[PDB]
Every structure is written in structure tokens, then in C-alpha cells.
Amino acid sequence: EFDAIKIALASPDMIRSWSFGEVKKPETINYRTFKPERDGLFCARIFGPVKDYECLCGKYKRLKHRGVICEKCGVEVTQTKVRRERMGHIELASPTAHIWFLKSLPSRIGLLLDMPLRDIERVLYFESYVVIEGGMTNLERQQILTEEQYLDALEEFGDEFDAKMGAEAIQALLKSMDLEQECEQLREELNETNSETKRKKLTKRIKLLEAFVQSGNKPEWMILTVLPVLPPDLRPLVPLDGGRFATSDLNDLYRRVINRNNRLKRLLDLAAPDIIVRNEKRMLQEAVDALLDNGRRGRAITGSNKRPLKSLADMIKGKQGRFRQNLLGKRVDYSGRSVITVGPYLRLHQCGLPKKMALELFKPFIYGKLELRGLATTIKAAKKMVEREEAVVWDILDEVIREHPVLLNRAPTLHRLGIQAFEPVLIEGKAIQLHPLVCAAYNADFDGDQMAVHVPLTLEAQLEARALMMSTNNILSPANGEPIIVPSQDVVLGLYYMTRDCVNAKGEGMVLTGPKEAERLYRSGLASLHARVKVRITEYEKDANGELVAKTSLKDTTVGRAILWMIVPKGLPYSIVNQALGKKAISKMLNTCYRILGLKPTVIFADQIMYTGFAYAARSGASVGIDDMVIPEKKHEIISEAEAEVAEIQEQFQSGLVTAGERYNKVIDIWAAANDRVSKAMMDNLQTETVINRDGQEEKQVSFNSIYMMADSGARGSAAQIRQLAGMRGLMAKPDGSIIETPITANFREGLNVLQYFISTHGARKGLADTALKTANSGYLTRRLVDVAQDLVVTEDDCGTHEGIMMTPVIEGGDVKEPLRDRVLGRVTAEDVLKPGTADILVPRNTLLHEQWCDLLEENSVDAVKVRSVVSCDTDFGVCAHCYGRDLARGHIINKGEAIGVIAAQSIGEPGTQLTMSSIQVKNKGSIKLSNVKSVVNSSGKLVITSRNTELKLIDEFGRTKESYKVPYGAVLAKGDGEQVAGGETVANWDPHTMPVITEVSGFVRFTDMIDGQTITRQTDELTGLSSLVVLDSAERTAGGKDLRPALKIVDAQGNDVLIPGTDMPAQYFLPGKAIVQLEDGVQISSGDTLARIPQGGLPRVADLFEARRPKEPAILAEISGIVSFGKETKGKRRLVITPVDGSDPYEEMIPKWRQLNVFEGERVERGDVISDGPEAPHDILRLRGVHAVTRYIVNEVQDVYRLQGVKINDKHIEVIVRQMLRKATIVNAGSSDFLEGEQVEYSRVKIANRELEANGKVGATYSRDLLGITKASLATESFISAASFQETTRVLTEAAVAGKRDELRGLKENVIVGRLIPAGTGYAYHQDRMRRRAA
């Protein structure tokens, strides 16, 4: 039908070609008879007939004569629907500037004319003249003039030159200009300009001019001489039933425009003075500019409610514009909604649908089945039968819903499991019955939640509901590969109570012939569910060939685990139920069953688990009383001891020994110690209070307390709440965050008094307000991520690349936070993984690392696997199915057509509402190993690191690292490199509060330009015994030694200048200001000791990481690898220079010296080493260290936020967003290509252009990748429909219009806007057919 959407500027000829007549009069309709008035805003002659096939005089009334232009009134005889399609126009008496191309910055009229917007707004508001042609005169072409200056120019030059004002002048300037000549002239004066700011202005102006000359646009079309009129059925004037009318604001704005325009034509005919016609032209300009964009220039026009009128631009932009409110989401037929209730009798694929909802949702299905089966002779008869609700329409309704799925949806749909399909079971209620196991997927509790039901009509929609979205296909999560159809509070508590053991329980010690006899004993009341017993268990294991081999053994079990074994499918072991099953043990049971046996046994197992958990929780009688919350009898004495302790700290404050700051801190710590004591005493009382008798001897076991059974199951609650029920609830914070020094010494079993309760409300309402105000932030982050990543589809099977990230375990300091297993599970390897014993490949090159392969990776001790990632995929316009890896929801390699960007964006932004708003001591045994090493030995026997970024890992006896610390520069290391340690001992120590400069090699003092009094101030003090010296500040020096930097260097007592071993450049120590030296001239210090000392999260953090924003004071990274030196000083910025000897040396930086610099002038640096310290900026990481480096940085810094809240998200989903962020490139060398230096091109475009150039021998362009934020990358797509739909519709539409852009509907949003199949999923085959048959 159509394959692209071209946007451009509208010529006045184009505006007159759309229109079906000119609107000459502001008349909307006639007031007596509501027929629309001639030549008006609603004109039946212009805009078409107001009734179907009927002219407005009624002379022609039937479609016998259609398409007939009546002669009594000029109304065509055709459908009235043409009033939604037929535009009109207004001939403006004065040219009027378009407000979008004048005011949306940067001004296109301003950028095109090389004219400031203040000058243009003064010319077109009739406040100044402008010389549209100079001639043989000193007046140039952009020279504005005042009124009297224009009079003086007319005195001196007469009627030779041409000068005008208003938008006629701007239109003459846009019309008279030559575009190709000025473009080539700007290219000339850009080749000869080296000022980077002028080069930026020139290149943006050149791209504007060349975008005009490549498209069909002319500049003067930005000045409206004809104005279009929207069809009157889109700005309707409709009579409300109460006699009153209801109009759109567009009729008021159009009527204002036509009134001012007809008055301007009047004044131009009357030959009015220039003051009046200038004021009228200004009013017409502001009325047209209020029609197009109200409020963009100055004060918004407000009509008759003192509320601003909604202009044309407001119809299409914003959260209430067409793009977001009617085109990306829309109200939908065949849709109902009701409250959800449990229905625990259901199977995983069933919902309960009310009969009175399903009779309305499926009305045409019932009409057609009543017509078909002969039960109704007509559709009117069938309608009456459904309306009366006969007994036969219920049989028909049972027929029409039989295998017909419905989609159930709980808004907010945070992720794709917020819409799942179900087969309806007709129930008689009015509430939907939602299966329990899917509630966690919807985040749905039955406390009033409502859910919408949608009916898939077509066979394709029914088959997607059944194949793609049905809740039996959805038992794994797409964020992490873990089960999401998972048992929960009542189920977990039932299975925990059944699978526990009691010591002397009824029926202990007998021997059973199997699980069926155990169930017989329990139901007969001959044995309790916890009696430790001996059951003959037959279990099957999948053999290596793939079938199930049996084994029969007497298992020491309890009666309840024997009973639960009856529902476990065959290929699972007995160790899977022979334990007290908490929430995680049940989730592991389900995950094991899914990996071992598959989906079809797992859904049966999940339903059976739910039924048996509900059943044996019902039989449990598990109840919360008030005696379940046992307060420890040590609470009162622990609290009295803490009160006595704070009283002694209070008398120590009254006696002045401690300041109120340390007093406050010590009172807080001796209240938190008491809180931890009370919590430990409470839990020690609560977990094991069951002491019971085995053959007379008392014996303690795990408590059967209900509060503890719920907490220990993981059914509901944690010890953080049990501590507030039965312990104390401790220190509460003020509204600002400073914790109050006296705690709530009460719990909820006892009362909180009035003051304790008020103090607790302080933090309660803060939590509630953050919850109510961060959903509007996490939803906005999710929206930005979706609109950056939507178009990423898996489009290939393999790109054949060999790149990939080196996955390693996440070791934050001393402990691991994510192993290699959950980091490489599901990836494909990028290179052959080989054993630590080399030359035998452990895992082959291109292998998908499923759970067996990961078990192989942890049998051996491989700790770094190079895997393939989407940031390194060679596929252009998409991602190969190998560089993604596994589809986490299914568990196999991902299919071609999966829309992985929307999955990644939902998986990241779904947990958003769970977010908020010195010496090293090796912990366990291992062999230390330091990297980035430059090392010497000290005078005493330490190991001294003369290197900045040396990092100390603990290589264990297997090769894998278990802790990773950062040892600073100059820190003395007690051990060597490769020496075993003891668990808990210290390896490295240093000075935390000051930075030492350490001796390179043993030698003698030379004070080179260390001038006393000019660069050195001598200080004296008694308790040191030896006088000290300070090298002077910048603001304390006299003229002198700041220009010649004072240096301390190495010599011998020989008089020979002993220097670094290996080089002969002069060794120095250039001591900066704010330093300390307590050493005199000629002192002897050996290598390895100091010579001088120098003193020194949440949801917004994720949002800032993805917007790629530069931090406040970023770390200054070394650009290129060279040696450090210094230039000019004291202009506020010391001048660093980094010189590589092996090339073009000078690279100079302008570091402001109020930053504490982190490198000395002697050592060599590399790209990325921090010259100064601070939070790294990701642009610098991408620029200097590479793409994989900023990828690793962003995924680590995002998972750091997500792992504090205990949120598992696979790294694929952050790597997708990172790939979509670094999607542009800048040309540094244009090469033999059609790009310009310094322009931002799509990276895939320049990559394939370089490929097709290198194919023909010509060398391609070279580029530098860019890191844009998710907003700046969403708005910079090559598709203007997606960008205009996202946000900033006005800027995107003006850029796209003046660029003459084209949008090929390639992503997902442009195909949702126009109502097509999306190019992902079941619409991917359709688009492959469409682009392989519309290409040849």
C-alpha cells in the first residue's frame, strides 16, 4: 500500500492543492437553522455535505445522482465522511512567519539567514528595517536599520536600495538568497577557519543549507502566505443535548485568524495609515502564531474560561497529544474489566470469567453461532435471544469459549508477564478468578485489584494467545531465567509444614512400603505428618542415553515428605523433597524440574505443588495468636543496661570529657548494640523454644511457632519484622534522616506510646511518599529505555564475529557478589575455553553455555570466559541470535525475530519501584598476586609499590580469585608476590590521610631550586625534636619559585648523579605545594621509604548512568601514553603535557590546580590511567579505553544499584541498552566517502559504507564512537516518527521538515503508529517477504 512517510515543507501551491476552497468568512453555522454557513469555517460547499448523499438545499437527496455538484447550493452529493478528509485554506493578506521555523531553537530562519533571532523578531514585529538589497551603497544585506536610520539612508541614497520590515522583508531575504553559492562559500571559509566555535557554527549552517538543496524545499516556504484549514469534522462544532453547543478551540483560533485577515484586507483597501496596518499585520502574525503553537511566543491566548486555547501543535504533542494518547495506545473494543479473586481450583492455563462478562465480550460469536445452528433465523432474532438470555445462549456460550483464550492484564503492565492468556472457565460471579501461581507475575493481590480482559478475535490472535502468551508458556522470567510461576505464602507454608520433622511425633520409627502407605497412615490418623520414618522410595534418574532408570532404597524420611513425593515427577531425585521446603527450596524444585524434564511436566508439577500446599496448610491450622510473639525475658534487663550506659555517657558529657558529637555517636552505638542484643535474644528464644522429650530425655528442635514458621518458610515476613513484633523496633530517623538518639524500646506486641508512635510515623510517611513519588520516575525511566531500544530485533543467526566481553566473577573487595556461573550461563563463548592445564579445549569456541557446560566450568576452576555480547555484534540493524545468547524465558538460544530491546527495557525498568528515592586484611587462605606492578624493597624488608594502579588479587590454589583489593601508590607490602597468608591477617598498609612520595632508588639529597625563603619556609616545633620545612603555596610565594618549580633529586656521595637503572634522564621529585618535609640537606634515605607527605545510589543513579551524564568533577584520564611534564601556571589551571617520545609528542591539558593531581612528573602513563581521581565519566571510558570498557563500566555500575535491593537481572539487558546508546559515530577523517569531518553519522551507515568502499579498493572513513544518553539517542534516530512520538515533537518535526526527511517504518513504533504488523515476532516473516518482494 505504502512503504515510507516523507515529511517536507508545504509550498503555497501544495497548500492550495490540498484545499477544496477558500474560507473567506469566519461564520461557523447559522444560529436559527444549524445548517453551516456559506464560505465559512464549516462550509458544506467547501468541506463537503453535512448529510450522506444530500446537498444543503435538499434539491438532490439520493445516491441515484451521486458526485453531483448541485447548482442551487454548490454542495457535492457524496458521503458526509469527506468532511474528515477535505481541507480548506485561508489566503493571508500579509506573509506570516511560521512560528515553528522561527522560534523552535535553533531558529531555522535565523540559522539560514545568519541572523540572530532578536534581529529577526525585531524585523518581523515592525520594530526595525532590513536592507534586502544593497546595490551601489555601503548598506549590506543583513544590515538592520531603525526608522530614523532608514529615513537617513533614504536621504543619502534614495530609491536605489531596497529595505523593508515585517515578514515581507524576511520572505524577501529568504527568497533572494542563493543556497549553493553560499554553501560553497561557507565551505571555503570553513576550510580556512581554525576557530573551533566558528567551525561548529559553520558546519551546522552548511548542513542546513545542504539539507535545503538536497530536498525539494525552498527557504521562503517557511513564511506562510497561504494557511491550511483543518477539516471541520476534526475540529467539530457539535450540539450537546441540552441545547448548548460544544466546539474545539481550533474554531476559535481559526475565527480569530480570519477576522484579523479580513480586517487587514479592509485596511489595505481603505489606504489606512502605516501605524494601523502595521498593528494589524502584527496582530495577524500573532493570531496565526497562536493558531499554530499557542504560548510559544509570549502570552498564551485564553478564551472564555481563562484557560489557554489548545492550538494545532498541542493536538499532536505531549502526554495528551495524538501520538501518545491515540496512536500508541488506544481504547479497544471487546474488552471488559473486573475485580480478581483467587479461584485456587484452577489449572495454570485457566481463568475464571464471569458469565455476564463473557456473554458481552463474545457477543458476535454468539450471534453467529445462533444464526449457524438454526436457533435464530436472523441476527435481530439472535440479538433478542442474547438480550433475553435464554437457556440456549448459555449452551452456545459454553461452545464459543471452549478453546478460545482471553488475555488478562493488570495495569501497570510493568513487564510482558503483565499480560497473559488463559482459557476462560465460566463462573457465576462478577469477579475474575485469577490462578494463584500467576499473581506474583502480575504483582496482584486480592485486595481490590481489577484486571482487564481482552478477546483475541482472529485465528492468528488466538494462536498467539495460545502459543506465545498462554500462562503455561510463561513459567520462566525474561529478566532472569528463574521461575516466575512460583509458589507463595500459603503454598510455601503448607509445603514447609508438611516437610518438617518433629522429634517424638506420633508414629515415629515405623517402616513403610512407600508413599501411599504414608498417606494411608496420615489420613487414618495413625501417624503424624512429621514422624521420622523409613519409607521405601523408588526414584528415577535420566541416564546418559536419555531414559529413566529406577532405583529402590529405604530412605530415612518423614511421613510428610513421603506424601509429597507422590506428586514429584519421575526424573527428579529424592533429595529434592527430603528437607524442610522453604520458598527457595520450592523454587529450586521447580527450576530443577524445568531443566531436567521440561515444560509439560513442570506445569503439572506446579499445579500439584499448589494443590498439596494449599491442602496441607488448611490441615495445618497455622494461626497467629498473641502468644506466638514471644518477647525475650532478657529484653527488660538489656534495655535497663543500655539506659544505664547512656546515663554514664550523659554524665561524661556533663563533665565535659566528650563533645556532644561523640556523645551522640556513642549513645547511638550503645543503643544499636542493645538492639542487636535484643534481636539475637528474641530469635534465639523464638527459633528453638521447642524442647520436647525423646524417650524421656529433653531435646531441642526447631520451633513450630507460627510466626517463626511463616518467617523461616519465606512465606511472609523476615526477621526484620519479627524483630518489631517481639523484639524492640529500635532507632527511628527524623524526617531529614538523622536518627533520633533514643529508640523505640517497645514492640508491637506491647504498645507504642504516643511519642514512640509519632516518632515512627516520621519514617512511615517518608516511605509512603517516596513510594507514591518514585513510581512516576521509574515509569519515565522505563519509557525512555523502551523508546531507545524498541527497534532492536534479533534479525540474524550469526554475524561470525570473534569479539566478546571477558566475563569474570564480580568480586567487590573481599567477597564475591556474582559467580562466573550466573554471569556466563546462557551466553555463547567467543573463544575456545581451555583448562588451566593448557592445550586441551575445555569448551569449544561457539558453544552455548547451558547448565551442563557451566557445571563443567565449575568442575575445573576456569574463572574468565570470553563470551559474545550484543555490544560487539557485527550485525547492522539488529542483533544476531548468537551474540544475544539464550532467550531467558524459554531456556534455548533465542529465535530470529525476538524484540529483545523491548524485553531489555522492560526487564530493567520493572524493578524500578524496588529502588530508592586504612589497611587491607585478607579474609581467607590464598596466594597473593599483584598486577600493574612497579616494585622495590624497602630498608626494612617490606615490599614497596612504586606504581599507581597496582591491584592485589588473591589467587587461590585452583587459580580462581576470591578477593581483589586496591593497594595505593607507595603502600608498604608485608609479603612478597606469591606468598601464602593467614585468614584475617594484614598484607598491605599505608597512610590514609596523606599521599607519600617514595624513594625510587637509594641515593643522596640535591635541593635543585629548592630555595629557602623563596620556595621553602622553615618551621619549628618542640615535640618533633627536628625542624621541618614546607614547599610554598601558590598564594604564599613571593615572585620567584612558582615559575621555576623546586625539585628534590638524587645524587651520590661520589658527586656522581646516580639515576634510574635503564635510563639516563634526570631523576626528580617535583614536590607540589601543600607538602611536608622534615628532612635536611644531604640526608641518606634508601629505596622504599617516604620522602615527603601531601595532605588531601538508587533510581536516580540508574537514570544518570543511562543518560550518560558527565559527573560533577570527573576523573581526568590520561589521553595518550607518554611522560608527564608541566607548562604555564597560575591562570587558574596548571598546564600538564603528556609526551610520547615515539611520535608526535605534545598533548597539553589545562587541569585546574584546585584538583589534587594524582601523578608525578617522572613516570610514564597509558591511556585511561587517572591523572586525577574522581567519578569517571563514561564518555572518557568509551573514548580512551574502548567500547567493551564503557560496556563493563555501565553494566557494573547498574548492577551495583540493582544488587543492593536484591534484584536479579541478566546482563544481556543492560548490554542491549548500552549498544543502543553507542549507536552514533563522528567522522574524524572523511576518507574516500561522502561524509564530512565532525558530523555525527549513524554507526551502521558508516560501517557498511566503509565495507563497500574497501570492497572497491578505496579506503573508507575512520570514526570515533559516541555515547549518547537514552533520551539523546532516542531523539537522534533516523526515523522521525519514533522521535516525534517519543518527546519534543516540535523540534523533531521542524528538523525533519526542513531536512526533507523520510521514514521507512523500520522499527516497531512506526509500524504501531500506522497500524501494521510489527517487524518483530510473528510479523517478522511478513516483513521479510515484504522487503524481499518490494526490493526485486
Partner: protein, 476 residues
């Protein structure tokens, strides 16, 4: 200065407007006398064109027959009484007598400015003078189109700066005797003008025809045209000073109409139109101050503008006056009896029928905006509760297609002749229905026979054999 500091067009208007100083009582007199001198000298300039004299005198004899009234012929005479006009137009007739033949061309050049300064004492009305000046603009268009024919009939043929050809043209006015020295340059322009030297023929004489039907030479009537332009621009210059000085009066009046439906600037622009009307309709000989006249005209213009273009569904000015009288009367009644008056007492304080008051009260409402939020709820509006009533229910679309199918089958159960008679007589399967005569010409059968055929098929289909499915298409 303040140029470029504001965006409000009201402030720019007041800025550009305050830079004109007001007038004293005697300043308006001076400006009005400048206007009057410009207009009566331009009326003397069209009096230099004696076809206007012929028109004046023939409508003067029609005044002797009273074709139209004298007030819109003449406003009086300066140094209505009709006996001045008759005999002193006879005096102008005797003046036309003494100028018609006293040319025997150096002695005729005094009687023409004597005509002008004896025409001095004449006053003329706007509309018949508008007829005269449209005739004069026809004269102007003819003069300029003939001189531009002379301009670009030769220069589309030649390349030469045409001042050499204008130097010989001015004064000849009768023939091509000025073309005898055109070729003497012998630079190729007058060579190419060879090929034009003929086709100017019926041009160059025909203007010279009417030249002496109006009596005066083409060059000196071009002088009359430029003197007319000078005098008229002199009048229009002084009409500009009087408008630009009284622009504060328009604002002082229009500030009283501010929130009555129009913007402030719309009111002051319509009042400016009214002020220009007052200026070109003002005469100072009545001795009244100009502001008292311009106030009437500005009030008229502003209230007429509010009556015409302040409403979405425009109501006429008579219904606007009716609604204003109604609101005033109900205002006074509420003030005297402390409650809103019923239409059956509002109709008796006025003297209109009660149903007229009811329809007037039904009329006076302004349309709601569809962006009005409901209950201060911003995400909703009035616009998304309004349904499209003109649509057809898809159950009714299915009913229509099912009725088409059922009718098609139960007419397929007939003879093709009579079934086509029914499909042809109604509009079934056809764009139009046909009356019996049409199909009588078509079926080669007389009218009442095929009428009986239609009745035959209708009686046939009324049976409960076939009409059991069709009856369910009838309502209950």
C-alpha cells in the same frame, strides 16, 4: 531604546502611538482645512477635465427633472437651499459658454484657471464625485497604458536607453512625425524599430481622438493627472495626521468594551476603522469639536464589531440588541425584586411574547470548549465523552447485509421477469429506482400491466412460504 524588549503587540502599539502629539482646538481646524483644500483642489483638478463639466450639467438638467435629491448632489456653497444651485449652475453654464469657443490657443489659457477659481465656490458630495473619479481613473488607466505601450512596444524590439526616444515624443501627440529622426542615430535600435513603425497605428491616433472630445492635450492632461495626484496625496497626508493624533481617543473608548468577547487590540483596530470613517466624514464648519464626532463613530464601529465577530455561532445585530435589552431589563428587575425574573414576567416588563423571550434566552449561550476538564480532572475533557452519533452500529451493518442476502434469495425464488421488475422498480442492485413509465419504455409493455406484475410478485411474496425469514427483519 525600548526596541526589541517586548513581545506584546499591545505594548508595541502604545509605543508607536504615544510618539504622536495630540491636537489643540485650533490644530484640528488647521488639519481639517488642509484636508478640505486638498479635496476641493483635486475636485478642481477633475474640473479641469470638462467631460466632468458635461456630466455635472446633464445631471443638473436631470435635477431640473429631479432624478435624485439635491443633498446628495450638493452640500451647499461656500463664499439645503436649492435655489442657489439652479441659477448658479446656470452661471457655470454661461462660464462653459464663454470657454467653449473663446480659443481663437494663447488666449484660451486664462479662461481655464478662471474656470477653476470660479469652480472654487463649489461643494461636491462623496458618491457622485466617486463616479467622477472612477471616470477619471479610467482616464488615468488609458493614459498610462498608452504611454506604457509607447514604452514597451519599442524596447521589447530594441536594446537602447529610451530617453533618446522620449526626447522626441513629448509634444507631437498627433502622428509619427517624431519618427523621422529616430533612424538618424543609425545604431541598430531604430533599425529594429523599423519592424514596429507600423503596428502602433490604431493606437497613436485613438487617444488623440478623445483628447479633443475632452478638449485638452494628452500631455497637459497628464499634467492634470499628476496635479490631481499631488492634490490627493496632499489631502490624504492631512487625513493621516488627524487619525494618528486621535488614536488615544480610540483606546480610551475601547477600554470600556474589553471583556465583551473581543481582544483589546481587535477593539482598538475596529475603533481605528471607525475613526478613519469619522475623519473622512468630518466637516469643521459646524464648529463642533472633532472628539465628540469621532466618539459616536468609534462607539458605532466597536459595538458593531462585537455584534458581528465576537461569537462562534454568530447571531444578527438585531438579536444582539434584543439580548442586550433583555439582560438590562432582567438586571433592573433583579435589582428591584431581589430574584431572577421569570420569563413570564420578563416578557411583561418588555412587550414581547413569552415564547420570543424563551427563544432569545435559548439563543444567548456560547459553545463550551471540548477541552473543558470535567470536575477539574485534567486527563479527561469534554471532548472524549462526546460520541459520534452519525455512525452505524455494526449489528445494523450485519442486519443490512443479511437483509440483502435474504431479499436476494427470496427474489431468486421468482420468475426472472417479475424479479427484475421488482429489482428495477425499487432500487435493488441498481443506483436508481424507476417509476412505471420508465420501465414501460424499457420492458416494451404498457404501464399498468407491469404495475399488475409488481402487485403479482408482492402478493406472491406475502405468502408464509418464503416470507418467514423476511418477517424477522421486521421489528417487534
Amino acid at each position: 531604546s525600548e526596541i526589541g524588549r517586548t513581545t506584546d503587540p499591545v505594548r508595541m502599539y502604545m509605543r508607536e502611538m504615544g510618539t504622536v502629539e495630540l491636537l489643540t482646538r485650533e490644530g484640528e481646524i488647521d488639519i481639517a482645512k488642509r484636508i478640505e483644500d486638498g479635496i476641493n483642489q483635486v475636485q478642481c483638478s477633475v474640473a479641469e477635465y470638462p467631460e466632468a463639466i458635461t456630466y455635472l450639467l446633464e445631471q443638473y438638467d436631470r435635477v431640473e427633472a429631479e432624478e435624485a435629491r439635491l443633498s446628495d448632489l450638493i452640500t451647499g456653497f461656500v463664499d439645503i437651499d436649492p435655489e442657489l444651485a439652479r441659477e448658479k449652475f446656470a452661471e457655470l453654464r454661461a462660464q462653459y459658454v464663454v470657454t467653449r469657443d473663446t480659443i481663437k490657443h494663447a488666449t484660451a489659457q486664462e479662461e481655464i484657471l478662471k474656470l477653476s477659481e470660479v469652480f472654487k465656490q463649489f461643494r461636491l458630495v462623496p458618491k457622485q464625485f466617486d463616479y467622477l473619479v472612477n471616470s477619471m481613473r479610467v482616464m488615468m488607466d488609458r493614459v498610462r497604458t498608452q504611454e506604457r505601450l509607447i514604452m514597451k512596444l519599442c524596447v521589447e524590439q530594441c536594446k537602447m536607453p529610451k530617453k533618446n526616444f522620449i526626447t522626441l515624443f513629448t509634444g507631437n501627440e498627433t502622428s509619427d512625425t517624431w519618427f523621422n529622426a529616430a533612424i538618424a542615430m543609425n545604431k541598430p535600435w531604430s533599425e529594429k524599430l523599423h519592424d514596429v513603425s507600423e503596428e502602433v497605428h490604431r493606437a497613436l491616433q485613438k487617444l488623440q481622438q478623445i483628447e479633443e472630445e475632452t478638449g485638452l492635450t494628452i500631455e497637459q492632461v497628464k499634467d492634470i493627472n499628476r496635479r490631481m495626484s499631488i492634490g490627493e496625496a496632499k489631502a490624504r497626508r492631512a487625513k493621516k495626521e488627524m487619525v494618528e493624533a486621535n488614536l488615544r481617543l480610540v483606546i480610551s473608548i475601547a477600554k470600556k468594551y474589553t471583556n465583551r468577547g473581543l481582544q483589546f487590540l481587535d477593539l482598538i483596530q475596529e475603533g481605528n476603522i471607525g475613526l478613519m470613517k469619522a475623519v473622512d466624514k468630518f466637516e469643521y464648519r459646524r464648529g463642533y469639536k472633532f472628539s465628540t464626532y469621532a466618539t459616536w463613530w468609534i462607539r458605532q464601529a466597536i459595538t458593531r464589531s462585537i455584534a458581528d465577530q465576537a461569537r462562534t455561532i454568530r447571531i444578527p445585530v438585531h438579536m444582539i440588541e434584543t439580548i442586550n435589552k433583555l439582560n438590562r431589563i432582567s438586571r433592573q428587575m433583579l435589582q428591584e425584586m431581589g430574584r431572577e425574573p421569570t420569563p413570564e414576567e420578563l416578557a411583561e416588563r418588555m412587550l414581547m411574547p413569552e415564547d420570543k423571550i424563551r427563544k432569545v434566552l435559548k439563543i444567548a449561550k456560547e459553545p463550551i470548549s471540548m477541552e473543558t476538564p470535567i470536575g477539574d480532572d485534567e486527563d479527561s475533557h469534554l471532548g472524549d465523552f462526546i460520541e459520534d452519533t452519525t455512525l452505524e452500529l455494526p449489528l445494523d451493518s450485519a442486519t443490512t447485509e443479511s437483509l440483502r442476502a435474504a431479499t436476494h434469495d427470496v427474489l431468486a425464488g421468482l420468475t426472472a421477469r417479475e424479479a427484475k421488475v421488482l429489482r428495477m422498480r425499487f432500487g435493488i442492485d441498481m443506483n436508481t429506482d424507476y417509476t412505471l413509465e420508465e420501465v414501460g419504455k424499457q420492458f416494451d409493455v404498457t404501464r399498468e400491466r407491469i404495475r399488475q406484475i409488481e402487485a403479482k410478485a408482492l402478493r406472491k411474496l406475502r405468502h408464509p412460504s418464503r416470507s418467514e425469514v423476511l418477517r424477522s427483519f421486521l421489528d417487534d
